[PDB]
Amino acid sequence: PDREKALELAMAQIDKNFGKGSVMRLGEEVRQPISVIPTGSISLDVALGIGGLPRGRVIEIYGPESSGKTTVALHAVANAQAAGGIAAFIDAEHALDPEYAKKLGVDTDSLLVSQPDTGEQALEIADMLVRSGALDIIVIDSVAALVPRAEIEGHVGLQARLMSQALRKMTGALNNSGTTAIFINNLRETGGKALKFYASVRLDVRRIETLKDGTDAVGNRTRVKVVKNKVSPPFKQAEFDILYGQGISREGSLIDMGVEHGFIRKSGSWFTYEGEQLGQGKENARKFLLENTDVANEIEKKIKEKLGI
Template identity: 45%
Template structure:
């Protein structure tokens, strides 16, 4: 072992017992029910894929994760170096004078506060909405934003930022919008076979190891396509090839399952969505979580807290009345939510009780609360697809 470490560098090989804790650290996703399904939250230093149909809440879920990182993670911006657009190494203080030309929203206040984690959004779709992000709790002034010209530029920037160790979370929105340079420079209608799949495969081989070393979580948002000529089985497939399915430690499928109407019933104000953990290397897979997304506000966090507290018997429901300890919250779910909204200290207390119960036995809570779904054996489809190629 000493010879190998001398040849390849200290820490190339080590005994697991002397390497510290082997547990994967997590951070909140912004949705309590999803945190329980994931066994604690989103894993640090891993690749996460969130996919689903259009307008299902993929970007909303990613923005909530960004907001949580900015609050809960310790900033790594200090004591870091960066590689600027010209390819040269620049120290962090130089960025205040000459920042990345392709990034928006400066970092001066982050350096002054020295608080909170750092997140980056690679907006390949060029549809980033600062007002909506701010409503979801994102610190848009300190959010690092990149709107790349092509897929190679997007992934190279993301990889450099990941290797710098300065960011805790990088979100790529979306894989389908990572257009290869050759496709952009070519004419519309030209046959460009497998360019995006090769691009993703090459990038993920580099980024997976860099993310693990830097402790940076990579979230890839992805869209659904349909296979041609499939009459039996599931015709849906995610774009960008199959490399992301293998490299991702967590794959989340999000789908709308209903609409939320106003009290009067004359207006649709949100969506009821279901997230299924299709793959997880850090917790038990095939769990699912249901929660509400309110238009203009994002995930209903109080709704998640109330649902979890009810299942864990922290909040009791007798008939249509909700109560916590000796205190009545209201008759009906809507009135109970309104009461929690008007009493933030009480809602924080209930949430702490839920998270405490979660920490004591997340496995038991997750198995009893979250619905388990039978595996859909996507690996078999991947194997047959590889055999045909």
């Protein structure tokens, strides 16, 4: 009684019992469900397997201070908006900057922003906003800031239940609503034990290295390791460039990928897309595509095919 056919026989018994991707073969490039939201990072998009954050899924983006977490999230908001979506930001950090947001594609003016007082009020006005079935994406700034009713008033219990409760009720909510929920986490190098088991995707955003280009510093090179993923196979990672005051670099992203995929070449550190050269050094080819969007288009259109959709 053949293993191969005796494995899938039962391995299939599992999905049917515990969900879609409860058991995946790290090798499979399967792709049966989409309605995903581009993260504006072609590299991270593919690393996700479904070319973006699955909608209707609770997502967690954790990492140290100044890693790129929120930038990605706002980048998520930018797209879900630019496609006729309604985005809500449950600010509890009071740090969000419109000026930087708007410069990334966020229709600030028409962005719902609620500034809770208690961790409970936050998780409510959020779970409640989700139920209205109007939102497409909702991101919550600072899982840390979500402090309970008391504490704010006066070991003795924990907030980590405040998360299990609202998450229990809210996880099933956005499930049949199609509203993807981003939760932003932080520095340790609590309630994070409940979210770690609900998120259908959990990204680990660490700032791999500092971008310079001969002046002071512009942005940073960020690396993201999708450690949990129930839509596609996990453990894949991606890198990209985040320029100070401009966001993620689509242009420079097309290059990193362009070459890693053999569409552009590198003789003497001189990037060139078949026949016509771009320039020496990366920060210069980035400045090349930054002007001619046609040449960058076909390059974006060539990589779009080379991989899953």
